Amino acid sequence: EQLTKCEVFQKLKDLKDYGGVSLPEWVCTAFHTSGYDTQAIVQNNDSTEYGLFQINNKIWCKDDQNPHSRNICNISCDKFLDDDLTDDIVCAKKILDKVGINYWLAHKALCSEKLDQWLC
Amino acid sequence: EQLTKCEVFQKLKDLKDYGGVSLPEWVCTAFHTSGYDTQAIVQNNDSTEYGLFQINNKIWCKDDQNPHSRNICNISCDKFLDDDLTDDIVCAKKILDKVGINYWLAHKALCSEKLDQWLC
Ligand SMILES: [Ca+2]
Numbered sequence A, B: 001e002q003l004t005k006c007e008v009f010q011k012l013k014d015l016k017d018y019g020g021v022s023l024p025e026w027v028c029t030a031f032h033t034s035g036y037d038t039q040a041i042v043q044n045n046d047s048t049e050y051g052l053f054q055i056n057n058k059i060w061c062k063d064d065q066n067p068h069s070r071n072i073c074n075i076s077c078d079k080f081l082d083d084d085l086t087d088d089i090v091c092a093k094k095i096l097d098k099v100g101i102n103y104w105l106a107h108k109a110l111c112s113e114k115l116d117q118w119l120c
């Protein structure tokens, strides 16, 4: 389901200020990551990334493509392709605590200027 | 509107192989740039970027915010905010001639793996 900025804003409420990352910075990260598409799947030679947060199957969730995943989020990757963001959010917090915002942003400044434009 | 993978595939047909860039490579580029949204507008402290190709008002188009724009594409940035992609494409060709795919991609590798995933 392709979500709108405002719908995403509502749905990511429980991530607000988590780790010190504001809600507007979360919606921005989501835009640049999957364009608000809960079912986005992107493949690489090596891995595959799932849903809105583009969670990979080599470290975070378990795939048929890769059963030998470290599976930190202890979940099957396809749980990140539905409309329920609950489990996506739980996994997104570990990624933040383990690797930081750069998992998603190549440069942080990408989501630090004019943050009020992400406000719904 | 927020177009789907297949809608964008048909709409950018005009660009197939231009500068050597295959069609699946353009769809990949659009995904990563605007998430397929023709009305995306993103602001920086320095400039604003419009539409599908996130064309900036500092060098390519002109708007109320910055009149000192070099305006290489000789056009108003708001023409890059509707559902007709004809003029966006003509301007995207100029950017490709001048700066290359690196206007959109930090690393071309980003859009060279599993190109068949971007096929409709
Ligand atoms: Ca889910």
Ligand SMILES: [Ca+2]
Pocket: B079, B080, B081, B082, B083, B084, B085, B086, B087, B088
């Ligand atoms: Ca247009």
